[PDB]
Design an enzyme around this catalytic site. Structure first.
Site, PDB file in Angstrom:
ATOM      1  N   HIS A 162     -17.991   5.116   6.280  1.00 26.98           N
ATOM      2  CA  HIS A 162     -16.609   4.666   6.154  1.00 26.98           C
ATOM      3  C   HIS A 162     -16.102   4.027   7.441  1.00 26.98           C
ATOM      4  O   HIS A 162     -15.389   3.019   7.399  1.00 26.98           O
ATOM      5  CB  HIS A 162     -15.719   5.843   5.760  1.00 26.98           C
ATOM      6  N   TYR A 218      -0.207   8.464   2.539  1.00 23.27           N
ATOM      7  CA  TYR A 218      -0.684   8.867   1.221  1.00 23.27           C
ATOM      8  C   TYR A 218       0.460   9.378   0.358  1.00 23.27           C
ATOM      9  O   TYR A 218       0.489   9.142  -0.857  1.00 23.27           O
ATOM     10  CB  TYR A 218      -1.760   9.945   1.357  1.00 23.27           C
ATOM     11  N   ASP A 278      -9.244   0.784   6.521  1.00 25.54           N
ATOM     12  CA  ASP A 278      -8.755   1.977   5.811  1.00 25.54           C
ATOM     13  C   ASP A 278      -7.306   1.711   5.406  1.00 25.54           C
ATOM     14  O   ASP A 278      -7.032   0.650   4.822  1.00 25.54           O
ATOM     15  CB  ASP A 278      -8.986   3.206   6.686  1.00 25.54           C
ATOM     16  N   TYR A 304      -8.604  14.819  -1.986  1.00 26.28           N
ATOM     17  CA  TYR A 304      -7.838  14.932  -0.749  1.00 26.28           C
ATOM     18  C   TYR A 304      -6.522  14.168  -0.821  1.00 26.28           C
ATOM     19  O   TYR A 304      -5.515  14.627  -0.273  1.00 26.28           O
ATOM     20  CB  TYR A 304      -8.676  14.468   0.446  1.00 26.28           C
TER      21      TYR A 304
END
Length: 317
Positions: free
Chosen positions: A295, A230, A101, A150
């Site tokens: 995932h 992010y 990730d 998101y």
């Protein structure tokens, strides 16, 4: 038993889990994960002659969380990892790296900035992200997915934190970890995950209630640290123009499940399979697409991922 330490890396106290002796494998977790997400791999590698090292990244778990969003660029995290390797593995020229990730992203940057420190890489979920001058990443993501995507919802400071607080930490952890849709995750504004209140969340067989408790006890302190990753996506892009046209100089084994949403982000499938991935990563040995896997592949397929890691790193003994 898995050893746990607090190590000072240039003023940042990092929590490091560690087990085994031998060649170092540095595990880099993602969002919303911890060192805990590697626990199986930490065991199923330490018992095979490797020294598994898995830290809580900056802003996660028991590692220090700087308060400013500007302290969460890829450079900060890669510098943390370089200092960690210098502290706990100083006599080691190169180490093995496994990422997942955001960790995978970090791993890419680690292989991009310091290929002299990496012997081989196993990356999960997220393929390499060659720097693109045409458009900022968040702009393209928003153009495809919209404001409720998101990653876009994460941008404004405090908003997604307020929504998570309304939902509750354990429910947020479950919503993230039980996700299995091969498509974009939407977070409707002011409505969390857009799910009925007090609805049942059935845990898969690979995720136990104790795992949820471990994640919840740590993320009750806050999600801001992980969300700041992010929040620095466009900053990372703006500061990585020097590496336009760069190639990863490290042998790489990439694994992803065909239900992972990251696998279906714009242009990712064609990039992986139509030659762009191999062009940007010349030593990309194999690409493994697991059918029916989501995932969290290192948790959903723990033993298979451990076997892939071991078999790939055995080629460099």
């Amino acid at each position: 038993d898995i050893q746990h330490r607090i190590v000072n890396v240039n003023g940042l106290n990092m929590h490091v889990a560690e087990k085994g002796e031998g060649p170092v494998i540095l595990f880099i977790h993602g969002f919303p994960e911890l060192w805990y997400s590697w626990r199986h791999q930490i065991i199923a590698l330490a018992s095979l002659g490797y020294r598994a090292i898995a830290p809580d990244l900056r802003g996660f778990g028991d590692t220090d969380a700087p308060p400013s969003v500007s302290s969460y660029t890829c450079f900060h995290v890669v510098g943390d990892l370089i200092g960690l390797l210098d502290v706990v593995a100083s006599d080691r020229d190169k180490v093995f790296v496994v990422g997942h990730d955001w960790g995978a992203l970090i791993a890419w940057y680690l292989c991009l900035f310091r290929p002299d420190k990496v012997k081989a890489l196993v990356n999960l979920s997220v393929a390499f992200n060659p720097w693109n001058p045409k458009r900022k990443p968040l702009e393209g993501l928003k153009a495809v997915y919209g404001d409720d995507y998101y990653m876009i919802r994460f941008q404004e400071p405090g908003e997604i934190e307020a929504e998570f607080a309304q939902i509750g930490t354990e429910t947020v952890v479950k919503e993230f970890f039980t996700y299995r849709t091969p498509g974009p995750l939407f977070l409707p504004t002011g409505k969390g995950f857009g799910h009925p209140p007090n609805a049942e969340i059935v845990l898969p067989s690979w995720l136990s209630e104790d795992d949820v408790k471990n994640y919840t006890s740590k993320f009750e302190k806050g999600f801001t640290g992980g969300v700041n990753y992010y929040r620095n996506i466009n900053v990372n892009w703006e500061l990585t123009a020097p590496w336009a046209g760069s190639q990863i100089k490290v042998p790489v084994k990439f694994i992803v499940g065909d239900l992972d949403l990251t696998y279906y982000m714009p242009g990712v499938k064609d990039y992986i399979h139509k030659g762009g991935f191999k062009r940007d990563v010349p030593l990309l040995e194999e690409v493994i697409v697991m059918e029916g896997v989501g995932h969290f592949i290192n948790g959903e397929k723990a033993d298979a991922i451990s076997e892939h890691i071991y078999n790939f790193f055995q080629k460099f003994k």
